[PDB]
């Protein structure tokens, strides 16, 4: 079908999208320490 | 592969970073840095990972293996990042951004929360670390130099002259002086803190060297703390001395032809372990290796397509 | 409802009965419990996916941002391919397609994620009572 191709299309690009480690900046610190 | 005693890297507007060697002008590896420009790059103390930060993201690249991708990336900030740095033991990373924040990042994969945020009223251009790794110097576009102490939570504000933005500030590893330059070329030098024990963070005005009539871009000492190279927008770099601040050697890349009309500025410089050869990265799409005595260049690297505004050059402790 | 809380949080954040208009008169499997004699269907990590699927179908009826809503449904079928395998969820979506209005390309996008299913519960119970 059409959505079947789209579903597997996302799978192919998802394999190479998990090779990077991301570290976000959370608004927290040792304020109480 | 970064498994060499001496490594060298350059980056700029070409969206790629080129790795070189001092032995020969060949290029080893080309990495990918998409939809961004590299402001400044530095290598971790472990010499197994390099840091490249620009426009709201700090992309980390691998050196031991051959990975053309930013394996480790950081986000959260909303503006550009002026500079990056690391502790001598590789514990935490301090970054200064254009969003008027000079924060500290924690490299421990746990909820240690070793991060501190410092707020200023103007965007900052240069961030430096004290040689004892206990203080911190932050400078904004208002010309006010802030001395931040990690032990306490108070920062002294020092301003030599207002209305002129500063661009760089560096402290020699031997802890003998403290120099900074601004948008007019004046390179103020302050004798650093004498209270090495309790960190009394006292400063006095030592001298002022009038040079670099045009904009001043970057100033940096040498590992032996006997030289001082100050970049400038007039396509010239001057190396000073710590004895009486006389012109030890003057360097220029001007072709002498009026038809060029400032073809490219001189952005950064870096010394070797023995403080004998210097590496300069100009905005003429190439970088050169100079010598402090003969003046004539040693090698030349021309693998970039666009201008390069940052370079990282380090080797082993032995020199 | 879940719609108010979903916009204030994230799908992964919450994870760190679900059918709204499900009555025992308009379901493919539940309506046959009394008339035929089927057995009751058998089964918190899964109930939070039923709401997410349903809210994206409802938001797909406005045709305002179809690409954003279509992407949100394809990811669920990729990370959790077994959530589109319950007969009751299909009945709820089929019931919603009758009252609301959907564009033909968007209507064909739905009812096409359920093509590669087995629906073992209906087959098991129908065989026993008929035999
Ligand atoms: Zn049902």
Angle at the Cα of B169 from the Cα atoms of B164 and B171, rounded to 5 degrees: 150
> Whose CA is closest to B193, among B229, B151, B245?
B151
Q: Is C22 annotated as a binding residue?
A: yes
Experimental approach taken: cryo-EM
Contacts of A11 in chain C (CB under 8 A): 78
Contact B77 A19 (CB under 8 A): no
Residue B24: CB atoms within 10 A of its CB come to 8
Are β-strands B247-252 and B286-291 bridged in parallel, bridged antiparallel, or unpaired? unpaired
B127 to A27, B118, B141, C63: CA distances (angstroms): 22, 12, 12, 50
Resolution in A: 3.2
- Burial label for C37, CB within 10 Å (0-12, 13-18, 19+), is exposed
B281 CB within 8 Å of a chain A CB: no
Q: What is the CA radius of gyration of chain A?
A: 19
Candidates B70, B113, B151, partner chain A, best to mutate (most A CBs within 10 A): B113
C12 CB within 8 Å of a chain A CB: no
> Whose CA is closest to B229, among B179, B265, B193?
B179
Q: What is the residue-wise DSSP string for C65-104?
A: SHHHHHHHHHHHHHH-TTSTT-HHHHHHHHHHHHHS---H
B299 to B124, B237, B254, B288: CA distances (angstroms): 34, 17, 17, 6
Contacts of B71 in chain A (CB under 8 A): 19-21
CA–CA dist C63, B116 (Å, integer) = 45
Say if residues B65 and B110 touch (Cβ distance below 8 Å). Answer: no
Candidates A5, A7, A12, A18, partner chain C, best to mutate (most C CBs within 10 A): A7
B77 CB within 8 Å of a chain A CB: yes
> Whose CA is closest to B99, among A25, C2, A6, A3?
A25
C1 CB within 8 Å of a chain A CB: no
> Whose CA is closest to C121, among C27, C20, C23, C25?
C27
Q: Which two tokens stand for residue C49?
A: 């996916």
Q: Crossing angle for the helix pair C47-59 and C66-79, nearest 10 degrees?
A: 160
Residue B206: CB atoms within 10 A of its CB come to 14
CA–CA dist C13, C83 (Å, integer) = 19
End-to-end CA, chain B: 22
Indicate the helix (H) or strand (E) that contains B82. strand B81-86
C59 to B98, B248, C100, C109: CA distances (angstroms): 39, 71, 11, 14
Residue B125: CB atoms within 10 A of its CB come to 20
CA–CA dist B176, B244 (Å, integer) = 14
Point out which residues pair with B230 in neighbouring strands: B219, B238
Say if residues C28 and C41 touch (Cβ distance below 8 Å). Answer: no
> Whose CA is closest to B102, among B92, B88, B112, B111?
B92
**Residue found by looking up tokens 């038809």 in the block:** B259
**Exposure string for C79-112, b = 16+ CB within 10 A, e = fewer:** eeeebbebbbbbbbbebbeeeeebeeeeeebbee
**Residue found by looking up tokens 């007969």 in the block:** C87
């Amino acid at each position: 079908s059409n959505t079947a191709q789209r579903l597997e299309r996302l799978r192919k690009e998802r394999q190479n999208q998990i090779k990077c480690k991301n570290i976000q900046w959370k608004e927290r610190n040792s304020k109480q320490s | 592969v970064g498994s060499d005693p001496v490594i060298l890297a350059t980056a700029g507007y070409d969206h790629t970073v080129r790795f070189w060697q001092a032995h020969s002008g060949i290029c080893t590896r080309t990495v990918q840095h998409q939809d961004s420009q590299v402001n400044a790059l530095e290598v971790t103390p472990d010499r197994s990972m390099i840091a490249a930060a620009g426009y709201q993201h700090i992309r980390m690249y691998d050196l031991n293996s051959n990975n053309p991708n930013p394996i480790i990336s950081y986000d959260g900030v909303n503006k550009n990042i002026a500079s990056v740095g690391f502790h001598e033991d590789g514990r935490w990373m301090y970054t200064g951004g254009e969003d008027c924040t000079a924060r500290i990042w924690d490299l421990r994969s746990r909820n240690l929360q070793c991060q501190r945020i410092f707020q200023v009223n103007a965007p900052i251009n240069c961030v430096c670390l004290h040689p004892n790794q206990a203080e911190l110097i932050v400078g904004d576009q208002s010309g006010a130099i802030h001395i931040w102490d990690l032990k306490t939570d108070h920062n002294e504000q020092l301003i030599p002259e207002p209305e002129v933005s500063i661009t760089s500030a560096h402290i020699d590893p031997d802890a003998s002086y403290m120099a900074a330059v601004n948008s007019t070329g004046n390179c103020y030098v302050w004798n650093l803190t004498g209270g090495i024990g309790d960190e009394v963070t006292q400063l006095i005005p030592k001298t002022k060297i009038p040079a670099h009539t045009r904009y001043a871009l970057q100033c940096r000492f040498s590992p032996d703390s006997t030289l001082l190279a100050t970049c400038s927008a007039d396509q010239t770099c001057k190396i000073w001395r710590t004895s009486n601040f006389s012109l030890m050697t003057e360097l220029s890349i001007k072709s002498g032809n009026p038809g060029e009309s400032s073809r490219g500025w001189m952005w950064g410089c870096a010394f070797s372990g023995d403080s004998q050869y210097i590496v300069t990265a100009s905005s003429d799409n190439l970088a050169r290796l100079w010598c402090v005595e003969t003046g004539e260049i040693k090698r030349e690297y021309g693998g970039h397509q666009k201008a390069v505004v940052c370079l990282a050059f380090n080797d082993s402790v032995l020199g | 409802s879940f719609h108010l809380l979903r916009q204030q949080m994230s799908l992964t954040e919450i994870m760190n009965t679900g059918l709204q208009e499900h009555t025992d008169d308009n379901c493919l499997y539940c309506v046959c419990i009394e008339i035929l004699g089927f057995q009751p269907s058998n089964q918190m990590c899964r109930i939070l996916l039923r709401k997410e699927v349903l809210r994206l179908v409802i938001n797909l009826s406005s045709s305002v941002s179809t690409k954003c809503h279509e992407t949100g449904l394809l990811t669920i079928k990729e990370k959790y391919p077994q959530t589109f395998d319950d007969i009751c969820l299909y009945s709820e979506v089929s019931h919603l397609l009758s009252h609301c209005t959907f564009r033909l390309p968007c209507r064909r996008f739905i009812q096409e994620l359920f093509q590669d299913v087995q629906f073992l519960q209906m087959h098991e119970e129908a065989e026993a009572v008929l035999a």
